[PDB]
Symmetry: C2
Subunit: 188 residues, 2 copies
Amino acid sequence: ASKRALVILAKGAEEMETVIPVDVMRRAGIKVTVAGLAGKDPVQCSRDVVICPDASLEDAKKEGPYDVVVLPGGNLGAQNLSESAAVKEILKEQENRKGLIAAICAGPTALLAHEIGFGSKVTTHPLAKDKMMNGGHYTYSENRVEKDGLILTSRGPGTSFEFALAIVEALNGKEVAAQVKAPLVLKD
Amino acid sequence: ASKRALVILAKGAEEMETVIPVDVMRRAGIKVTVAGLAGKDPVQCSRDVVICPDASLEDAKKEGPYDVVVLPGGNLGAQNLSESAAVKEILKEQENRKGLIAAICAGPTALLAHEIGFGSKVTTHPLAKDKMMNGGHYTYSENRVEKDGLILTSRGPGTSFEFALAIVEALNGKEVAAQVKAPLVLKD
Protein backbone atom coordinates (compact mmCIF):
# COMPACT_ATOMS: atom_id res chain seq x y z
CA ALA A 1 0.00 0.00 0.00
CA SER A 2 3.14 2.17 -0.14
CA LYS A 3 3.67 4.73 -2.89
CA ARG A 4 7.04 4.70 -4.65
CA ALA A 5 9.15 7.48 -6.15
CA LEU A 6 12.13 7.33 -8.50
CA VAL A 7 14.61 10.21 -8.37
CA ILE A 8 17.13 10.14 -11.23
CA LEU A 9 20.49 11.61 -10.19
CA ALA A 10 23.07 12.62 -12.79
CA LYS A 11 26.35 14.51 -12.55
CA GLY A 12 25.74 18.24 -12.45
CA ALA A 13 22.33 17.93 -10.80
CA GLU A 14 21.30 20.72 -8.45
CA GLU A 15 21.82 19.10 -5.06
CA MET A 16 19.18 21.21 -3.29
CA GLU A 17 16.58 20.23 -5.91
CA THR A 18 17.52 16.59 -5.29
CA VAL A 19 17.68 16.44 -1.49
CA ILE A 20 14.61 18.52 -0.64
CA PRO A 21 12.11 16.31 -2.55
CA VAL A 22 13.80 13.11 -1.36
CA ASP A 23 13.70 14.29 2.26
CA VAL A 24 10.15 15.62 2.11
CA MET A 25 8.83 12.56 0.28
CA ARG A 26 10.33 10.18 2.85
CA ARG A 27 8.79 12.31 5.60
CA ALA A 28 5.49 11.52 3.86
CA GLY A 29 6.10 7.77 4.04
CA ILE A 30 6.87 7.43 0.33
CA LYS A 31 9.48 4.83 -0.61
CA VAL A 32 12.07 6.83 -2.56
CA THR A 33 14.86 5.39 -4.70
CA VAL A 34 17.65 7.79 -5.62
CA ALA A 35 18.99 6.14 -8.77
CA GLY A 36 22.35 7.06 -10.26
CA LEU A 37 22.14 7.64 -14.00
CA ALA A 38 25.68 6.32 -14.53
CA GLY A 39 25.63 3.57 -11.89
CA LYS A 40 25.81 3.08 -8.13
CA ASP A 41 28.88 5.31 -7.75
CA PRO A 42 28.80 8.64 -5.90
CA VAL A 43 27.47 11.59 -7.88
CA GLN A 44 29.15 15.00 -7.87
CA CYS A 45 26.41 17.62 -7.94
CA SER A 46 26.56 21.11 -9.42
CA ARG A 47 27.90 22.75 -6.24
CA ASP A 48 30.29 19.85 -5.45
CA VAL A 49 28.08 18.12 -2.91
CA VAL A 50 28.65 14.38 -3.43
CA ILE A 51 25.68 12.05 -2.93
CA CYS A 52 25.72 8.26 -2.84
CA PRO A 53 22.71 6.91 -4.78
CA ASP A 54 20.60 4.07 -3.44
CA ALA A 55 20.99 2.11 -6.68
CA SER A 56 21.96 2.31 -10.32
CA LEU A 57 19.24 3.40 -12.72
CA GLU A 58 19.60 0.03 -14.44
CA ASP A 59 18.71 -1.85 -11.25
CA ALA A 60 16.00 0.64 -10.26
CA LYS A 61 14.45 0.27 -13.72
CA LYS A 62 13.77 -3.42 -13.01
CA GLU A 63 11.95 -2.69 -9.72
CA GLY A 64 9.20 -0.50 -11.15
CA PRO A 65 6.64 0.75 -11.67
CA TYR A 66 6.84 4.06 -9.79
CA ASP A 67 3.99 6.37 -8.85
CA VAL A 68 6.23 9.36 -9.65
CA VAL A 69 9.44 9.90 -11.60
CA VAL A 70 11.35 12.96 -10.41
CA LEU A 71 13.84 14.87 -12.54
CA PRO A 72 15.97 17.38 -10.60
CA GLY A 73 17.43 20.44 -12.28
CA GLY A 74 20.92 21.77 -12.70
CA ASN A 75 21.91 22.74 -16.23
CA LEU A 76 24.51 19.99 -16.73
CA GLY A 77 22.37 17.44 -14.91
CA ALA A 78 19.40 18.17 -17.16
CA GLN A 79 21.61 17.86 -20.24
CA ASN A 80 22.79 14.43 -19.06
CA LEU A 81 19.16 13.42 -18.52
CA SER A 82 18.24 14.73 -21.98
CA GLU A 83 20.94 12.61 -23.66
CA SER A 84 20.14 9.32 -21.91
CA ALA A 85 18.20 6.63 -23.76
CA ALA A 86 17.44 4.88 -20.46
CA VAL A 87 15.69 8.04 -19.27
CA LYS A 88 13.69 8.22 -22.51
CA GLU A 89 12.43 4.66 -22.00
CA ILE A 90 11.52 5.29 -18.35
CA LEU A 91 9.64 8.49 -19.18
CA LYS A 92 7.76 7.12 -22.19
CA GLU A 93 6.69 4.12 -20.09
CA GLN A 94 5.58 6.40 -17.25
CA GLU A 95 3.60 8.54 -19.70
CA ASN A 96 1.92 5.46 -21.19
CA ARG A 97 0.78 4.09 -17.82
CA LYS A 98 -0.41 7.60 -16.84
CA GLY A 99 2.02 7.94 -13.96
CA LEU A 100 3.13 11.25 -12.53
CA ILE A 101 6.23 12.95 -13.97
CA ALA A 102 7.80 15.77 -11.96
CA ALA A 103 10.66 18.05 -13.04
CA ILE A 104 12.09 21.25 -11.57
CA CYS A 105 14.12 24.23 -12.82
CA ALA A 106 16.12 22.98 -15.83
CA GLY A 107 14.79 19.43 -15.41
CA PRO A 108 11.73 20.02 -17.62
CA THR A 109 13.94 20.53 -20.68
CA ALA A 110 14.52 16.77 -20.57
CA LEU A 111 10.81 16.30 -21.31
CA LEU A 112 11.26 18.21 -24.56
CA ALA A 113 14.31 16.14 -25.50
CA HIS A 114 12.30 12.93 -25.03
CA GLU A 115 9.03 14.26 -26.55
CA ILE A 116 7.10 13.86 -23.30
CA GLY A 117 3.83 15.59 -22.51
CA PHE A 118 3.55 17.79 -25.59
CA GLY A 119 0.57 20.11 -25.29
CA SER A 120 0.93 20.49 -21.52
CA LYS A 121 1.26 23.71 -19.56
CA VAL A 122 4.73 23.78 -17.96
CA THR A 123 7.08 26.09 -16.11
CA THR A 124 10.87 26.19 -15.90
CA HIS A 125 13.57 28.37 -14.46
CA PRO A 126 13.35 31.70 -16.33
CA LEU A 127 16.78 31.02 -17.84
CA ALA A 128 15.50 27.73 -19.33
CA LYS A 129 12.30 29.13 -20.86
CA ASP A 130 13.65 29.64 -24.39
CA LYS A 131 15.10 26.13 -24.47
CA MET A 132 11.85 24.57 -23.26
CA MET A 133 9.75 26.55 -25.75
CA ASN A 134 11.73 25.62 -28.87
CA GLY A 135 9.01 24.58 -31.32
CA GLY A 136 6.05 25.77 -29.26
CA HIS A 137 5.24 22.23 -28.10
CA TYR A 138 4.18 23.38 -24.62
CA THR A 139 2.39 26.39 -23.13
CA TYR A 140 4.50 28.38 -20.71
CA SER A 141 3.44 29.31 -17.18
CA GLU A 142 5.14 31.54 -14.63
CA ASN A 143 3.50 29.84 -11.65
CA ARG A 144 5.93 28.64 -8.99
CA VAL A 145 4.42 25.16 -9.31
CA GLU A 146 2.44 24.03 -12.35
CA LYS A 147 0.48 20.79 -12.77
CA ASP A 148 -1.22 19.86 -16.05
CA GLY A 149 -2.49 16.31 -16.31
CA LEU A 150 0.35 14.05 -15.21
CA ILE A 151 3.09 16.68 -15.71
CA LEU A 152 4.19 18.62 -12.62
CA THR A 153 6.85 21.31 -13.04
CA SER A 154 8.49 23.97 -10.89
CA ARG A 155 10.86 26.86 -11.39
CA GLY A 156 13.94 26.77 -9.17
CA PRO A 157 15.82 25.84 -6.01
CA GLY A 158 13.66 28.22 -3.98
CA THR A 159 10.48 26.48 -5.16
CA SER A 160 11.77 23.03 -4.15
CA PHE A 161 9.64 22.80 -0.99
CA GLU A 162 6.43 23.72 -2.82
CA PHE A 163 7.43 21.35 -5.62
CA ALA A 164 7.99 18.48 -3.19
CA LEU A 165 4.76 19.08 -1.26
CA ALA A 166 2.80 19.13 -4.53
CA ILE A 167 4.13 15.62 -5.21
CA VAL A 168 3.06 14.51 -1.73
CA GLU A 169 -0.41 15.99 -2.25
CA ALA A 170 -0.80 14.29 -5.63
CA LEU A 171 0.25 10.90 -4.24
CA ASN A 172 -0.95 10.88 -0.62
CA GLY A 173 -3.54 13.66 -0.47
CA LYS A 174 -3.86 17.12 1.00
CA GLU A 175 -4.02 16.09 4.67
CA VAL A 176 -0.72 14.19 4.63
CA ALA A 177 0.96 17.11 2.86
CA ALA A 178 -0.31 19.54 5.50
CA GLN A 179 0.88 17.21 8.29
CA VAL A 180 4.35 16.88 6.75
CA LYS A 181 4.53 20.64 6.17
CA ALA A 182 3.94 21.88 9.72
CA PRO A 183 7.23 20.72 11.36
CA LEU A 184 9.25 22.26 8.50
CA VAL A 185 8.67 25.87 9.66
CA LEU A 186 7.86 27.09 6.15
CA LYS A 187 6.66 30.67 5.81
CA ASP A 188 3.58 30.02 3.66
CA ALA B 1 40.95 37.09 0.11
CA SER B 2 38.49 34.17 0.17
CA LYS B 3 36.20 33.56 3.13
CA ARG B 4 36.06 30.02 4.50
CA ALA B 5 33.25 28.01 6.08
CA LEU B 6 33.33 24.78 8.08
CA VAL B 7 30.21 22.60 8.02
CA ILE B 8 30.32 19.77 10.57
CA LEU B 9 28.41 16.71 9.36
CA ALA B 10 27.41 13.94 11.77
CA LYS B 11 25.18 10.90 11.41
CA GLY B 12 21.54 11.86 11.81
CA ALA B 13 22.03 15.39 10.51
CA GLU B 14 19.13 16.94 8.62
CA GLU B 15 20.32 16.67 5.02
CA MET B 16 18.33 19.68 3.80
CA GLU B 17 19.83 21.86 6.55
CA THR B 18 23.28 20.67 5.41
CA VAL B 19 23.00 20.93 1.63
CA ILE B 20 21.18 24.27 1.35
CA PRO B 21 23.82 26.31 3.24
CA VAL B 22 26.69 24.48 1.52
CA ASP B 23 25.16 25.11 -1.91
CA VAL B 24 24.22 28.73 -1.23
CA MET B 25 27.58 29.54 0.36
CA ARG B 26 29.51 28.14 -2.61
CA ARG B 27 27.27 30.17 -4.92
CA ALA B 28 28.58 33.16 -2.94
CA GLY B 29 32.21 32.24 -3.62
CA ILE B 30 32.85 31.02 -0.08
CA LYS B 31 35.25 28.09 0.27
CA VAL B 32 33.21 25.48 2.16
CA THR B 33 34.57 22.34 3.81
CA VAL B 34 32.00 19.69 4.70
CA ALA B 35 33.82 17.85 7.48
CA GLY B 36 32.72 14.43 8.71
CA LEU B 37 32.56 14.26 12.49
CA ALA B 38 33.55 10.58 12.49
CA GLY B 39 36.00 10.68 9.57
CA LYS B 40 36.07 10.90 5.77
CA ASP B 41 33.51 8.11 5.34
CA PRO B 42 30.03 8.71 3.90
CA VAL B 43 27.46 10.07 6.35
CA GLN B 44 23.91 8.72 6.55
CA CYS B 45 21.61 11.67 7.21
CA SER B 46 18.30 11.66 9.06
CA ARG B 47 16.21 10.85 5.98
CA ASP B 48 18.74 8.31 4.61
CA VAL B 49 20.42 10.64 2.13
CA VAL B 50 24.11 9.68 2.15
CA ILE B 51 26.67 12.46 1.70
CA CYS B 52 30.41 12.08 1.16
CA PRO B 53 32.26 14.70 3.24
CA ASP B 54 35.14 16.69 1.81
CA ALA B 55 37.38 15.74 4.74
CA SER B 56 37.46 14.38 8.25
CA LEU B 57 36.92 16.89 11.04
CA GLU B 58 40.40 16.03 12.31
CA ASP B 59 42.02 17.11 9.03
CA ALA B 60 39.74 20.13 8.62
CA LYS B 61 40.63 21.23 12.17
CA LYS B 62 44.27 21.65 11.11
CA GLU B 63 43.39 23.89 8.14
CA GLY B 64 41.66 26.65 10.09
CA PRO B 65 40.74 29.23 11.02
CA TYR B 66 37.25 29.55 9.53
CA ASP B 67 35.17 32.69 9.17
CA VAL B 68 32.06 30.67 10.07
CA VAL B 69 31.40 27.31 11.72
CA VAL B 70 28.05 25.84 10.69
CA LEU B 71 26.12 23.30 12.76
CA PRO B 72 23.21 21.65 10.91
CA GLY B 73 20.22 20.29 12.78
CA GLY B 74 18.58 16.91 12.97
CA ASN B 75 17.89 15.61 16.47
CA LEU B 76 20.39 12.74 16.37
CA GLY B 77 22.95 14.83 14.51
CA ALA B 78 22.76 17.57 17.13
CA GLN B 79 23.17 15.00 19.89
CA ASN B 80 26.31 13.66 18.21
CA LEU B 81 27.64 17.22 17.93
CA SER B 82 26.80 17.84 21.60
CA GLU B 83 28.79 14.79 22.74
CA SER B 84 31.94 15.48 20.71
CA ALA B 85 34.99 16.94 22.42
CA ALA B 86 36.46 17.91 19.05
CA VAL B 87 33.39 20.07 18.42
CA LYS B 88 33.77 21.69 21.85
CA GLU B 89 37.36 22.67 21.07
CA ILE B 90 36.45 24.05 17.63
CA LEU B 91 33.57 26.10 19.02
CA LYS B 92 35.44 27.49 22.03
CA GLU B 93 38.29 28.51 19.72
CA GLN B 94 35.85 30.15 17.30
CA GLU B 95 34.20 32.02 20.17
CA ASN B 96 37.58 33.23 21.46
CA ARG B 97 38.69 34.62 18.09
CA LYS B 98 35.25 36.23 17.66
CA GLY B 99 34.36 34.19 14.61
CA LEU B 100 30.82 33.56 13.46
CA ILE B 101 28.97 30.49 14.75
CA ALA B 102 25.80 29.43 12.93
CA ALA B 103 23.36 26.68 13.96
CA ILE B 104 19.89 25.74 12.73
CA CYS B 105 16.87 23.85 14.10
CA ALA B 106 18.21 21.41 16.71
CA GLY B 107 21.81 22.45 16.03
CA PRO B 108 21.79 25.27 18.60
CA THR B 109 21.37 22.78 21.45
CA ALA B 110 25.02 21.87 20.84
CA LEU B 111 25.95 25.41 21.90
CA LEU B 112 24.35 24.76 25.30
CA ALA B 113 26.18 21.45 25.66
CA HIS B 114 29.52 23.20 25.04
CA GLU B 115 28.70 26.37 27.04
CA ILE B 116 28.96 28.63 23.98
CA GLY B 117 27.50 32.12 23.75
CA PHE B 118 25.68 32.23 27.07
CA GLY B 119 23.66 35.42 27.36
CA SER B 120 22.86 35.55 23.64
CA LYS B 121 19.43 35.74 22.04
CA VAL B 122 18.83 32.51 20.11
CA THR B 123 16.11 30.60 18.30
CA THR B 124 15.59 26.89 17.71
CA HIS B 125 13.00 24.59 16.25
CA PRO B 126 9.92 24.89 18.51
CA LEU B 127 10.40 21.26 19.56
CA ALA B 128 13.94 22.05 20.78
CA LYS B 129 13.05 25.16 22.80
CA ASP B 130 12.78 23.47 26.20
CA LYS B 131 16.11 21.70 25.72
CA MET B 132 17.86 24.92 24.69
CA MET B 133 16.39 26.89 27.59
CA ASN B 134 17.43 24.48 30.36
CA GLY B 135 18.99 26.79 32.95
CA GLY B 136 17.91 30.07 31.36
CA HIS B 137 21.37 30.68 29.89
CA TYR B 138 19.98 32.24 26.70
CA THR B 139 17.04 34.45 25.77
CA TYR B 140 14.59 32.83 23.39
CA SER B 141 13.41 34.37 20.12
CA GLU B 142 10.76 33.20 17.68
CA ASN B 143 12.30 35.00 14.71
CA ARG B 144 12.95 32.80 11.69
CA VAL B 145 16.58 33.94 11.75
CA GLU B 146 18.23 35.44 14.84
CA LYS B 147 21.68 37.03 15.08
CA ASP B 148 23.12 38.25 18.39
CA GLY B 149 26.79 39.15 18.37
CA LEU B 150 28.62 36.26 16.72
CA ILE B 151 25.79 33.73 17.23
CA LEU B 152 23.42 33.18 14.29
CA THR B 153 20.53 30.75 14.74
CA SER B 154 17.51 29.62 12.75
CA ARG B 155 14.45 27.49 13.33
CA GLY B 156 13.99 24.69 10.80
CA PRO B 157 14.38 23.11 7.38
CA GLY B 158 12.04 25.70 5.88
CA THR B 159 14.21 28.55 7.17
CA SER B 160 17.38 27.07 5.64
CA PHE B 161 17.50 29.52 2.72
CA GLU B 162 17.11 32.57 4.97
CA PHE B 163 19.65 31.04 7.36
CA ALA B 164 22.18 30.51 4.56
CA LEU B 165 21.72 33.99 3.06
CA ALA B 166 22.22 35.54 6.51
CA ILE B 167 25.62 33.83 6.63
CA VAL B 168 26.46 35.19 3.18
CA GLU B 169 25.41 38.70 4.23
CA ALA B 170 27.50 38.53 7.41
CA LEU B 171 30.59 37.35 5.53
CA ASN B 172 30.35 38.95 2.08
CA GLY B 173 27.86 41.78 2.53
CA LYS B 174 24.31 42.59 1.51
CA GLU B 175 24.97 43.08 -2.21
CA VAL B 176 26.50 39.64 -2.74
CA ALA B 177 23.63 38.03 -0.83
CA ALA B 178 21.08 39.82 -3.02
CA GLN B 179 22.96 38.76 -6.17
CA VAL B 180 23.09 35.12 -5.06
CA LYS B 181 19.41 35.21 -4.07
CA ALA B 182 17.88 36.33 -7.37
CA PRO B 183 18.51 33.15 -9.46
CA LEU B 184 17.08 30.96 -6.68
CA VAL B 185 13.45 32.00 -7.34
CA LEU B 186 12.70 32.51 -3.65
CA LYS B 187 9.31 33.98 -2.77
CA ASP B 188 10.51 36.72 -0.40
